[PDB]
Amino acid sequence: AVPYVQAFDSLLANPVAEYLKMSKEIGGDVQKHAEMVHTGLKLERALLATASQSQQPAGNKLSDLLAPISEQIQEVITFREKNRGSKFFNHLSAVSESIQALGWVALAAKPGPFVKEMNDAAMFYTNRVLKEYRDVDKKHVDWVRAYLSIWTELQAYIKEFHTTGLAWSKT
Amino acid sequence: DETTALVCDNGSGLVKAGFAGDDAPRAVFPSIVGRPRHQGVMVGMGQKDSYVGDEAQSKRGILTLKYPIEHGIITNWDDMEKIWHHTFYNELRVAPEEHPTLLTEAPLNPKANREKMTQIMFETFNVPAMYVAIQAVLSLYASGRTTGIVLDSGDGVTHNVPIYEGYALPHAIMRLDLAGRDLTDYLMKILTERGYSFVTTAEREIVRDIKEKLCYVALDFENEMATAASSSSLEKSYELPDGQVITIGNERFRCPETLFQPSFIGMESAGIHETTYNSIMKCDIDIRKDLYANNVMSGGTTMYPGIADRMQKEITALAPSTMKIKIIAPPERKYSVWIGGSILASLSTFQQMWITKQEYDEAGPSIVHRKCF
Amino acid sequence: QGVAFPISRDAFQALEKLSKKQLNYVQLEIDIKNETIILANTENTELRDLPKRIPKDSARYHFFLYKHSHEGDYLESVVFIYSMPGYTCSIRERMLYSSCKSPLLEIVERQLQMDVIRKIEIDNGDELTADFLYDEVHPK
Ligand SMILES: Nc1ncnc2c1ncn2[C@@H]1O[C@H](COP(=O)(O)OP(=O)(O)O)[C@@H](O)[C@H]1O
Ligand SMILES: [Mg+2]
Ligand SMILES: [Mg+2]
């Protein structure tokens, strides 16, 4: 559609696809969590497509618009919370403690710094994955780089098209 | 882990929890509660009203943090209850009503405070049986003696605890509000002043690891500074999680020098050697000789290479010239409190020592001070 | 206070003899697995041979008849020794000898009126000289 919808589809096709590919290599809980993250990112893409051709709404219309993303964020978090005995608990925790980054779309201002904070919360856990698996298998190092690349690309995407917040259509 | 007794060492900064009979605690996590800095610019979006332990640590950039323990004493009870809930259900993953629980107690803990923890354990967590043991006594006993002075340097607090035949001398216990987390923060500061940038929560974790792996206590601090300035012999390389290699010099020994010189962080206090000496001097003159020959170290902040030799030098300088001085630094001292509790709670002879729910209902709250160790 | 490990019949009878000065030395050991206090040795021991009785490889309890002069009197005093040689002892061994000390001393006084004059905690036998024992029992 508009340049920012096209740019988000590129984000889905590049770091997100790499994250999905590495999550599949690890499998189990990591693969299951990735599919939920993917559903979240696809729900965000749909909201960006709505925002590209519609003016900024309020109250009930805006709550209904943001509710699928909010609910999918909770689904990602609930998965990790229902799987505390997971053999990949730091991978699940890196995701659950950072997935709120998708919520940048609800902010009236500074969405970029918010995604940066969410990326820092993921790094608390991804550094534990790196320390545990740097000598085990390279796929874990690649998965960490793939997951974190989603948020560094999202920050670059926000700075380019939504600097002061989600750029809703004017006309 | 079916009906095994639980051991919970609630530290000033770290909870050490596990099962009686294990050699090490199964769960070790921060004793901290985090709350959102601002009311909210967004609704829902996965936000929680509070975060506990590592979840609070990972999100510290957007939270205000609060330790339930202040000046070494449990103070914020609703927050302590959140940490106990997290320990049972999220870390150990047990039903507390199925496990007798041994809890550890900090020095100088008021009687009403021990009664409060017991009340929460029986009424809120519905534990079948309980027991309270004094942290310093478990560490002294684990060191192979019943008389001595414990130097317990943990995360948020350091204590000097003189003990005579398993009884701590409350009048002589000294407290220093300086320990592990303060040293991590000071290392962050002096590495920053050097040119490095460790700011984020993951970077704070890297600095904590640098401290635990490369820091040491110099025997002669000024001699060490002069060597560091003229020679690169004290330099140590450190591999960051991404593989980048950094080099650390005099920060290795300047960071724990703070324990001996609290002025390094601008703190107006005597160092751990002076508070050890002052604690010994508060005791009756006749026990002092046994205290000087039995300085036992416990806690993660006594893990520094060179700390035992430094304490031996400092106590020798303060004590009478003829006094026999000895520092005991057990290899297990990082977890000696927990290990001591684990050994105790695993004994068949201990199963009759628990305060049962039945016993608590009949004798009232005063039973915790009568059933002791 | 502490953990109470049952004392064997032989250890009790040895301690009974020491209270009557029929014996001058009683060495007790903890059976870690069985959670009991057993008799290790009752060897004839004069003060000059007491260092030889302290094992270097394990912790032990000792009840010793300390025969000595003090201010014109000849005293035959029971001294208790908890010897702990160091890191040769496992942390369970150190924990149990420490934890079991008080109930053992409580039952020895209550059931035998042993009148232990002094309780000493040592690292090795070599420090048990006549001077050390005298200064421990009669300090200043
Ligand atoms: N090897 C080590 N060297 C130095 N400090 C250490 C080491 N291991 C752990 N620590 C520090 O010990 C502290 C935790 O000590 P601990 O006795 O568990 O504290 P508390 O019981 O008060 O919670 C932390 O600040 C940690 O960084
Ligand atoms: Mg502690
Ligand atoms: Mg001694």
Numbering used by the authors:
A (entry chain C): 39 to 209
B (entry chain A): 3 to 375
C (entry chain B): 176 to 315
Publication text:
Another actin-binding protein implicated in filament disassembly is cyclase-associated protein (CAP). It is conserved in evolution from protozoan parasites through yeasts and plants to animals, and is thus among the small number (<10) of core actin-binding proteins present in all eukaryotes. CAP is a relatively large multidomain protein, which can self-assemble into oligomers, most likely hexamers. Here, we reveal that CAP promotes rapid actin filament disassembly by accelerating pointed end depolymerization of cofilin-decorated actin filaments.
In comparison to other proteins associating with the pointed end of actin, including tropomodulin, which prevents elongation of actin filaments and β-thymosin, which sequesters actin monomers, HFD domain binding heavily relies on contacts with SD2 of actin. Intriguingly, within this interface we observed a tailor-made hydrophobic cavity in the contacting α-helix of the HFD domain that coordinates Met47 of actin and thus locks the D-loop to an upright orientation. Accordingly, mutating Phe162 and Tyr163 in the HFD domain disrupted the interaction with twinfilin/actin monomer and cofilin/actin monomer complexes, demonstrating that these interactions are indeed critical for binding of the HFD domain to actin. Interestingly, the HFD domain interacts with the cofilin/actin complex with higher affinity compared to bare actin, although it does not make a direct contact with the ADF-H domain. Analysis of various actin structures revealed that actin is more twisted in the ADF-H domain/G-actin and in ADF-H domain/G-actin/HFD domain complexes compared to structure ADP-G-actin.
